[PDB]
Ligand binder design. Structure first.
Ligand code: 2WJ
Length: 843
């Protein structure tokens, strides 16, 4: 039984999709995968320290930066400790441990075991880490902030308790019987044929078509298409890709070799995906669950089992020329056969791996074997330092082989929870490229999620995000998610439960409000009024008393501050919500401010924000800080999600509107005035000016490399302390935004120089040449971003932007100049591109 199912109904409302359902399946791959993950799960559930799991200490092993050592002028750090409005300050060494620090306290007070939680967060300072390595601590230092801690007792591991569990040499050929659609598109008489590709990691190996026929709602061919590929030549994870043209309207896929290593036999009636108008949605083994409206195709398979010399000088240089080449530079036939003939020489350079493994004729049995023999002698790979860029490329859509991919996942095992979180989003998106539902990478995510509540928490939302918004992959992900929830342990099952209730109630309210204000620039009296009452109505006897904040799980949100909630003034009508801090030990009475928005796809934003963090940590490796401000954002459902409200901030546009705010007259001098009146001292002003030169610069480089640099004033923001930040990534040109008003804060005006500009240029160019040290990583991330998170993208030119941006294949000198010019374009255009948004109101 009875409470195996109530549970299962619980798991289904948390997941947001029913995995036990089998209405959309033509084999048993998902259920097998549900069976398959019990053990990896139970393994990690069995092997985890109950205590440390309950306290999820957030820790890093990275060096403390130069800029944060400069924040410690005494080899000594302050830490206020409280019990019940009684508290003392302790002078502590950066290398002191929480345990050790508890020795130095027990003396001071009194003349059994407790723990150091952070005042106002479900965060802890525990475990054998020197405090200098707890993330909360580094964050306090960076922002000029006092470390406040309360002395309470551990959380009880019982609360995590997991519920106990209860469970031939023939050429290949394929019979096209035909297609069926209840209702035809456009309606005139065009032309229709079927295309049947045998694919492997986007390599097309062989291809046959049918004779075309007129597009009638039922078309019949009854033809064998004989490929030349031999059955024995077919490689695991090969896809029979079936497509319809009249041109490309529909596609569906079928794994020729199933999760048991059996050739696929029998009749099939696949409901096909319809195009819109390259992209990860094109790869899915899933069929369209919409049986009533979708085009469908009918087929038959009936075809069983299966599971040196010294290299000369001037070719070495061609080989090396190739290996050095970036991830997006294409390989020639010539290239590919070079790599292959010298596969053993290539095997020594881990950088060569992606290129080498795409010089493999995967449609030849013998070659694969030699390739598997090649993988056997994996000494140099196993031993190399972990390179994420390189690891990630082997997980992209170019690699379908399970053992190539698995060595990449081998290298990720050595990542610490700190780095998993950096790449988690991108690793979840890369499940989309796995031929099978059960994969080394899917198990890795599972395993790293269960090991650590912070990874588990984000794993839940990231996966739920995709389940709710993609039919192409909701089945797969729903299976991985189910597997997570069965090991995460009852505390969390209750946490997630609270969270789902909240963000479903609030989405109702978000959408009901959009209804009332048609568009009409003004947000009405009646409008805000109805907001309040709905919120009053929800708080009254339904909403959870409290809940974790999805984009920062340390924070527990209390009641809604109904007075402060409102509707924002966009064409979309996002909610502005503020909640009380549910933690009574909180250092403040400062509300938690969340924004709910429907209208842009928030997955794009998540992805962009996450590259931003990556770019921040890349800057940590050269002791740089550009004070980026990647606010929280969790994509929750269909074109909808939540956003972190940054406190004490306004729009550039609005600082322009204050003094002028005309129809578009922009003034050079206002930004600097705004800061002064929002700086009490004149010291804190120059700090704002400082913060701004870094934040401006950071956002100039980042935004440019990503090609999201021509933005409007309104979608750029500044905090009252100089911290600048772009928002709204969902949504004559300019490379980036360095307007005359930014420039005026840098003591400069329409072609001259000055100290703070000399600084700005110094940082940009450094920031720039740095990111280029990580070219391959960024290229891989961006290219993955597009394929898994955008519309349809040109599998050359949309993607090929960034490599021209990072000015690939260039000496440092050139590239610095290249950037400097870009600044000079924004100096030439001044306000002109800014100006131009409006003017087109009628264009
Ligand atoms: C005080 C205040 O209004 N702060 C704000 N912070 C943010 C951060 C992000 C976004 C945002 C909104 C939509 C899409 N993307 C980001 C809006 C605000 S308002």
């Amino acid at each position: 039984s009875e409470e195996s199912q109530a549970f299962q109904r619980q798991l289904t409302a948390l997941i947001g999709y029913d995995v036990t359902d089998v209405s959309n399946v033509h084999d048993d791959e998902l259920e097998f995968t549900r069976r398959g993950l019990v053990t990896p799960r139970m393994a990690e559930v069995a092997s985890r320290d109950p205590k440390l799991y309950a306290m999820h200490p957030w820790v890093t092993s990275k060096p403390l930066p130069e800029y944060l050592w400069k924040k410690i002028a005494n080899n000594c750090i302050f830490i206020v400790i409280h019990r019940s409005t009684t508290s003392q300050t302790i002078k502590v060494s950066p290398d002191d441990t929480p345990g050790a620090i508890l020795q130095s306290f027990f003396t001071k007070m009194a003349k059994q075991d407790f723990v150091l939680r952070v005042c106002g967060r479900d965060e802890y300072l525990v475990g054998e880490t020197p405090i200098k390595n707890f993330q909360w601590v580094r964050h306090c230092l960076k922002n000029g902030e006092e470390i406040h801690v309360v002395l309470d007792t551990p959380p009880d591991p019982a609360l995590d308790e997991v519920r106990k569990e209860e469970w031939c040499d023939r050429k290949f050929r394929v019979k096209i019987r035909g297609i069926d659609i209840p209702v035809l598109p456009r309606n005139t008489d065009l032309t229709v044929f079927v295309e049947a590709n045998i694919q492997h990691g986007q390599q097309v190996l062989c291809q046959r078509r049918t004779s075309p026929k007129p597009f009638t709602e039922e078309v019949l061919w009854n033809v064998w298409l004989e490929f030349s590929i031999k059955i024995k030549d077919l490689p695991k994870g090969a896809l029979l890709n079936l497509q319809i043209y009249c041109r490309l309207l529909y596609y569906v896929n079928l794994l020729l070799i199933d999760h048991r290593f059996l050739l696929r036999r029998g009749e099939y009636v696949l409901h096909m995906w319809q195009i819109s108008g390259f992209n990860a949605d094109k790869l899915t083994s899933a069929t369209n669950p919409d049986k009533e409206n979708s085009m469908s195709i009918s087929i038959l398979l009936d075809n069983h089992p299966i599971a040196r010399a010294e290299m000369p000088n001037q070719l070495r240089k061609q080989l090396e020329a190739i290996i050095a080449t970036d991830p997006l530079n294409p390989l020639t036939a010539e290239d590919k056969e070079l790599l292959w003939h010298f596969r053993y020489e290539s095997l020594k350079h881990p950088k060569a791996y992606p290129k080498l493994f795409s010089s493999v004729k995967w449609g030849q049995q013998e070659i694969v074997a030699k390739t598997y023999q090649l993988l056997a002698r994996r000494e140099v790979w196993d031993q190399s330092a972990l390179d994420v860029g390189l690891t990630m490329q082997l997980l992209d859509c170019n690699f379908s082989d399970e053992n190539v991919r698995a060595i990449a996942v081998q290298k990720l095992e050595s990542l610490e929870d700190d780095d998993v979180l950096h790449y988690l989003l991108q690793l979840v998106q890369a499940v989309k490229f796995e031929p099978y539902h059960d994969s080394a990478l899917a198990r890795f995510l599972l395993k790293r999620g269960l090991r650590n509540k912070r990874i588990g928490h984000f794993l839940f939302w990231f996966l739920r995000s995709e389940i709710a918004q993609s039919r192409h992959y909701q089945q797969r992900f729903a299976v991985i998610l189910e597997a997570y929830l069965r090991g995460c342990g009852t505390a969390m099952l209750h946490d997630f439960t609270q969270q789902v209730q909240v963000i479903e109630m609030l989405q109702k309210v978000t959408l009901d409000i959009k209804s009332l204000s048609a568009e009409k620039y003004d947000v009405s009296s009646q409008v805000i009024s109805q907001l309040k009452q709905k919120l009053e109505n929800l708080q009254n006897s339904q909403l959870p008393e409290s809940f974790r904040v999805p984009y920062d799980p340390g924070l527990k949100a209390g009641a809604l501050a109904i007075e402060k909630c409102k509707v924002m003034a966009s064409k979309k009508k996002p909610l502005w919500l503020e909640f009380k801090c549910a933690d009574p030990t909180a250092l403040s009475n400062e509300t938690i401010g969340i924004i709910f928005k429907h209208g842009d796809d928030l997955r794009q934003d998540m992805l962009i924000l996450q590259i931003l963090r990556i770019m921040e940590s890349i800057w940590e490796t050269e002791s740089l800080d550009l004070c980026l401000l990647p606010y929280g954002c969790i994509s929750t459902g269909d074109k909808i999600g939540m956003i972190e409200i940054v406190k004490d901030a306004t729009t550039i546009a609005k600082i322009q509107q204050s003094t002028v705010g005309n129809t578009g007259a922009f003034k050079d001098e206002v930004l600097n005035h705004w800061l002064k009146e929002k700086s009490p001292t004149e010291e804190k002003f120059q700090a704002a000016v400082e913060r701004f030169v870094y934040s401006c610069a950071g956002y100039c480089v980042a935004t440019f490399v990503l090609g999201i640099g021509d933005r409007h004033n309104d979608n750029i923001m500044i905090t009252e302390t100089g911290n600048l930040f772009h928002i709204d990534f969902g949504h004559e040109r300019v490379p980036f935004v360095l307007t005359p008003d930014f420039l005026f804060v840098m003591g400069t005006s329409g072609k001259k120089t000055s100290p703070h500009f000399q600084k700005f240029q110094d940082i940009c160019v450094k920031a720039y040449l740095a990111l280029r040290h990580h070219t391959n990583l960024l290229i891989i991330l961006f290219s993955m971003m597009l394929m898994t998170g955008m519309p349809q993208l040109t599998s050359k030119e949309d993607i090929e932007y960034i490599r021209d941006a990072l000015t690939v294949g260039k000496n440092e000198e050139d590239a610095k100049k290249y950037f400097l010019d870009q600044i000079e374009v924004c100096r030439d255009k001044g306000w002109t591109v800014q100006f131009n948004w409006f003017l087109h109101l009628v264009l």
